[PDB]
Design a protein around this ligand. Sequence first.
Ligand SMILES: [Mg+2]
Ligand SMILES: [Mg+2]
Ligand SMILES: [Mg+2]
Ligand SMILES: [Mg+2]
Ligand SMILES: [Mg+2]
Ligand SMILES: [Mg+2]
Ligand SMILES: [Mg+2]
Ligand SMILES: [Mg+2]
Ligand SMILES: [Mg+2]
Ligand SMILES: [Mg+2]
Ligand SMILES: [Mg+2]
Ligand SMILES: [Mg+2]
Ligand SMILES: [Mg+2]
Ligand SMILES: [Mg+2]
Ligand SMILES: [Mg+2]
Ligand SMILES: [Mg+2]
Ligand SMILES: [Mg+2]
Ligand SMILES: [Mg+2]
Ligand SMILES: [Mg+2]
Ligand SMILES: [Mg+2]
Ligand SMILES: [Mg+2]
Ligand SMILES: [Mg+2]
Ligand SMILES: [Mg+2]
Ligand SMILES: [Mg+2]
Ligand SMILES: [Mg+2]
Ligand SMILES: [Mg+2]
Ligand SMILES: [Mg+2]
Ligand SMILES: [Mg+2]
Ligand SMILES: [Mg+2]
Ligand SMILES: [Mg+2]
Ligand SMILES: [Mg+2]
Ligand SMILES: [Mg+2]
Ligand SMILES: [Mg+2]
Ligand SMILES: [Mg+2]
Ligand SMILES: [Mg+2]
Ligand SMILES: [Mg+2]
Lengths: 94, 80, 136, 58, 116
Amino acid sequence: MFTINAEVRKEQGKGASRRLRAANKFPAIIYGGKEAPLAIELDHDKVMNMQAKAEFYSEVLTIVVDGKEIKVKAQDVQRHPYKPKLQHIDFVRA
Amino acid sequence: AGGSTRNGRDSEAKRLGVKRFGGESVLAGSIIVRQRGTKFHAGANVGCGRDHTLFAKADGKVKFEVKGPKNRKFISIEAE
Amino acid sequence: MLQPKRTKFRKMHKGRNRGLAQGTDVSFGSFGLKAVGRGRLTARQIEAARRAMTRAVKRQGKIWIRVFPDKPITEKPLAVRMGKGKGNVEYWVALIQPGKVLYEMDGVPEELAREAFKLAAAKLPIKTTFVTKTVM
Amino acid sequence: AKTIKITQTRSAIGRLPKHKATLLGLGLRRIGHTVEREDTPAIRGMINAVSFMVKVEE
Amino acid sequence: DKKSARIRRATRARRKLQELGATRLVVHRTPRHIYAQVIAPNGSEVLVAASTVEKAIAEQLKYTGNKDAAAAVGKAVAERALEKGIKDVSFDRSGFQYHGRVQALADAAREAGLQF
RNA sequence: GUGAAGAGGGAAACAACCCAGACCGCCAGCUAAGGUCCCAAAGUCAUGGUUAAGUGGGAAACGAUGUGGGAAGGCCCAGAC
RNA sequence: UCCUCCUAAAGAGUAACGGAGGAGCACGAAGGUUGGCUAAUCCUGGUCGGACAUCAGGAGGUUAGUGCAAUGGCAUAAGCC
RNA sequence: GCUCAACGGAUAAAAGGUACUCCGGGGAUAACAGGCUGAUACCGCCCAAGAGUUCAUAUCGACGGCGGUGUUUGGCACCU
RNA sequence: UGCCUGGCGGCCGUAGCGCGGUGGUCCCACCUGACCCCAUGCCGAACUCAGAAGUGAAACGCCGUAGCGCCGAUGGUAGUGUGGGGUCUCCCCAUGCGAGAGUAGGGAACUGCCAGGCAU
Ligand SMILES: [Mg+2]
Ligand SMILES: [Mg+2]
Ligand SMILES: [Mg+2]
Ligand SMILES: [Mg+2]
Ligand SMILES: [Mg+2]
Ligand SMILES: [Mg+2]
Ligand SMILES: [Mg+2]
Ligand SMILES: [Mg+2]
Ligand SMILES: [Mg+2]
Ligand SMILES: [Mg+2]
Ligand SMILES: [Mg+2]
Ligand SMILES: [Mg+2]
Ligand SMILES: [Mg+2]
Ligand SMILES: [Mg+2]
Ligand SMILES: [Mg+2]
Ligand SMILES: [Mg+2]
Ligand SMILES: [Mg+2]
Ligand SMILES: [Mg+2]
Ligand SMILES: [Mg+2]
Ligand SMILES: [Mg+2]
Ligand SMILES: [Mg+2]
Ligand SMILES: [Mg+2]
Ligand SMILES: [Mg+2]
Ligand SMILES: [Mg+2]
Ligand SMILES: [Mg+2]
Ligand SMILES: [Mg+2]
Ligand SMILES: [Mg+2]
Ligand SMILES: [Mg+2]
Ligand SMILES: [Mg+2]
Ligand SMILES: [Mg+2]
Ligand SMILES: [Mg+2]
Ligand SMILES: [Mg+2]
Ligand SMILES: [Mg+2]
Ligand SMILES: [Mg+2]
Ligand SMILES: [Mg+2]
Ligand SMILES: [Mg+2]
């Protein structure tokens, strides 16, 4: 089981996403179902450790945003081209 | 000393293109497009020349539009 | 030495080598040698690094080569002035962007692939790194 | 009447011709020249275009 | 197949009348019946129509798909067109040969008063 | 875009770089780039860190228990190294 | 000297002893119009007849064709009778 | 009626030599040398397949890679 | 008004293919015949004419079906205008624009005029 803590992005775009990855974070999005897509932000080192397991990309994950748990699955991940880092993750609502 | 070439040539630029754009009021007979083929096609009140030149048969504003099943580009003169 | 058999044209512009790469993930095999730097390689550098890892695995396992040198590089001869046509095609390169997986390998352990890709990377001008097959 | 103060704070020597025309449209002439213009979107667009070398005072 | 080749055979003069702005008479021909309709230059609505499927025309006839039926149709559509004030049209053969029942129809419409 | 056809201040000196466009005069003031120990105008300013190489104040592949910070890990008072 | 493409930086235009190719004609029908038609290639079967003549069906759907270079066009065919 | 094709066509009609040479000019343009550069050259270094009885690194060092100097052959044509 | 069908359009693949099913009162289609109108570089195949015995087999139309085709966000990424910066063959920062591909998902078209048939 993986429990991830997230925060709703106050601002979006290229400059913001570069600036989060400056401040050791990275954006993600939760989508799927009838609910609207949710633009979140994660801590990079936690999720980078959690993703080393295939359990991460197989099991159902709990994302806590505003104290609201969301069971999702890792649909797709954008990785850094030559560094062991994460750019962005798509989460599908289970 | 030595060398040569075989690739020195090129031809003159024929100044094709779109001479009057959309929403641009023209007189009758005004050349809209010069072109080789029918990259565009003649719509309403627009004639096609010998060299596939698109000219206005009437006066009014140019309307670019895509019609037909093949999504071909037609040029028409709206009335005004 | 890798080289296109036919080409539609004999010569090519110098171009540029900006942008990020596309062959980023380890597609086929298990271990990969990923380019970090930027530049152009050649068929000689490719074949030398292939030899160094084929010998380092003692032809055990399977090696993919993801790149192919398709860009011809011309040079003018010595004591020839700067005019009078484009120079003659001398060798072939592959433009390498950061992130390009250059080689892949499987059927061997990880440590053997490390020492093989290190022996190969000593023949290559660009700075490389070692990567593994990521799930997703 | 929703009018603002615009003050040229940098020089216009090596700047683009389009920026020089924008400063002429604002009526700015020299540095430190404080001018008083109405607040329209067209004015705000010129200020957006030369925001590096003016200082708008609301 | 045959339907498609008839359409290909017709779609040149149809597009030509489309750019001519011509009010157009459309003939359609079957082995049993023959159809006619006068179409506005927008091509989206009709003005008059006649056929051998109508009872008022078909009951006066022997067989619906002969030349005598085709002349009675072109006469009826001409009398309806002149009733509605439509006089000058352009005949669209709709990929048929101008021959036989089609020619007898257009000759009947010319004789009744249409102008093409 | 500048020079050419454009001076001034700065980059030691340095047409073309940075700031900035010289009507004239003044033993007045504010600033730009760039700077503030002395040559040489102005902070030996403040606070918190890093560097020990005169690095700063010239250079690569590569090499190395230099050193600072961070996240994780596997052995361990059932006694680790 | 002329034509076509790239260079040419999504209007036009744009240079080099830059990269690649052509033209210095032909046609009294290879023009006009009306009417009609629709390719390449492959598969199977079939007398001489064979990888490949002609014939019949099917796949395919313009990968063909355009008097000649290339580019852009072309099914309403500008292609073919 | 012109391959006036040197194709905006100097004339209807035209090839060469000069170390016997001369004038006007040019560092707008070459040779010498300087300068920039450093492909080449030279000097180093990296990896280490191998050779060296065994043994990569005593001595060499394939395939390939990174630099330095300004020293050759050259490039440009900034001074004269 | 409902259903079905034919014709002419609009639109131009969420509209197309495929697979399965289904239709014949009318319509349509095949279909019968051809001395004639007309036709075949031979051939009533086609074109055409005179018809209506048969069949919906084919074709067409309709219904269904996600094997495709097609459409397609959100977020991010690439790029880039201006300004600024660096270790300057390439990148970064502020700001503005913002893809393509891909993902979720959608999706087995919609609509107008006239006419006819059967029901109502
Ligand atoms: Mg930006
Ligand atoms: Mg000056
Ligand atoms: Mg100065
Ligand atoms: Mg200096
Ligand atoms: Mg000075
Ligand atoms: Mg300052
Ligand atoms: Mg002082
Ligand atoms: Mg102090
Ligand atoms: Mg252009
Ligand atoms: Mg442009
Ligand atoms: Mg022809
Ligand atoms: Mg025709
Ligand atoms: Mg055969
Ligand atoms: Mg001449
Ligand atoms: Mg000339
Ligand atoms: Mg002598
Ligand atoms: Mg002299
Ligand atoms: Mg000179
Ligand atoms: Mg010499
Ligand atoms: Mg010299
Ligand atoms: Mg040097
Ligand atoms: Mg060298
Ligand atoms: Mg030994
Ligand atoms: Mg050694
Ligand atoms: Mg060697
Ligand atoms: Mg020297
Ligand atoms: Mg030299
Ligand atoms: Mg020069
Ligand atoms: Mg000198
Ligand atoms: Mg079916
Ligand atoms: Mg028949
Ligand atoms: Mg059936
Ligand atoms: Mg987007
Ligand atoms: Mg998109
Ligand atoms: Mg569909
Ligand atoms: Mg269907």
